[PDB]
Amino acid sequence: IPEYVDWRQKGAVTPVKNQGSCGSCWAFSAVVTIEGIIKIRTGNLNEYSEQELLDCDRRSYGCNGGYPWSALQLVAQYGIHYRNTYPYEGVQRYCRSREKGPYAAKTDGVRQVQPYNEGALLYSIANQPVSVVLEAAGKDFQLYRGGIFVGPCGNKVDHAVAAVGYGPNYILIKNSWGTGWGENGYIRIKRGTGNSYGVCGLYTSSFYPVKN
Ligand SMILES: *C(C(=O)O)[C@H](O)C(=O)N[C@@H](CC(C)C)C(=O)NCCCCNC(N)=[NH2+]
Numbered sequence: 627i628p629e630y631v632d633w634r635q636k637g638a639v640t641p642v643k644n645q646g647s648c649g650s651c652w653a654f655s656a657v658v659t660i661e662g663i664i665k666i667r668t669g670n671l672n673e674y675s676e677q678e679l680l681d682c683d684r685r686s687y688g689c690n691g692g693y694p695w696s697a698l699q700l701v702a703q704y705g706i707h708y709r710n711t712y713p714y715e716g717v718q719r720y721c722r723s724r725e726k727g728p729y730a731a732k733t734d735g736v737r738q739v740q741p742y743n744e745g746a747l748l749y750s751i752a753n754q755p756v757s758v759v760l761e762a763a764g765k766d767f768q769l770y771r772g773g774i775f776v777g778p779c780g781n782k783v784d785h786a787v788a789a790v791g792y793g794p795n796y797i798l799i800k801n802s803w804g805t806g807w808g809e810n811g812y813i814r815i816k817r818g819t820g821n822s823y824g825v826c827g828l829y830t831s832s833f834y835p836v837k838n
Pocket residue numbers: 648649650651652687690691692693694759783784785786
């Protein structure tokens with residue numbers, strides 16, 4: 627795999643979103659990886675519905691948090707609608723997949739990255755955007771403005787985001803806190819520190835969709 631990856635530069639990343647007060651980061655992370663794999667496999671970049679996963683993933687807890695792997699499993703089992711068809715409301719509502727017509731996209735499965743393994747995650751990112759988790763509760767992360775972030779942070783992961791690239795000393799992360807946070811909504815998190823958790827626990831739990 628190459629020294630630098632940046633899926634934005636290959637047209638596989640949609641604009642940065644803002645989840646608002648709702649604890650829906652798990653759905654945004656999953657959606658980033660779906661948009662990416664659909665662009666990679668079909669050539670088209672579309673936006674897909676975080677709200678659909680928020681409402682319809684019965685293993686998740688709506689705005690009280692949830693599981694990226696469960697949202698991705700939902701998209702592989704049923705499918706997902708376009709964001710326009712099922713826009714983001716910032717609150718969990720009834721599942722309306724059935725009332726919104728045929729799904730827009732469907733995947734074929736979900737595969738987990740070997741946790742606590744930097745090279746495995748870099749490999750995954752080299753093939754596609756990956757859903758990852760990290761500890762975002764610390765003030766240093768909350769206030770990140772730019773540069774390669776080294777912390778301080780612990781490994782008590784609490785926030786799902788998406789890895790869309792990397793470089794020799796960082797992994798490139800698409801956050802769901804709007805375009806005014808970080809580097810136009812992105813953070814570059816230091817890698818190569820030898821800490822197996824990853825900076826801010828970045829290697830704890832990583833999933834990606836599979837689409838043949
Ligand atoms: C995301 C956020 O707004 O930061 C949100 O808090 C979230 O998804 N939290 C997750 C932790 C990460 C995805 C690793 C979470 O708490 N998941 C467990 C399920 C939700 C908590 N339990 C219940 N019953 N609500």
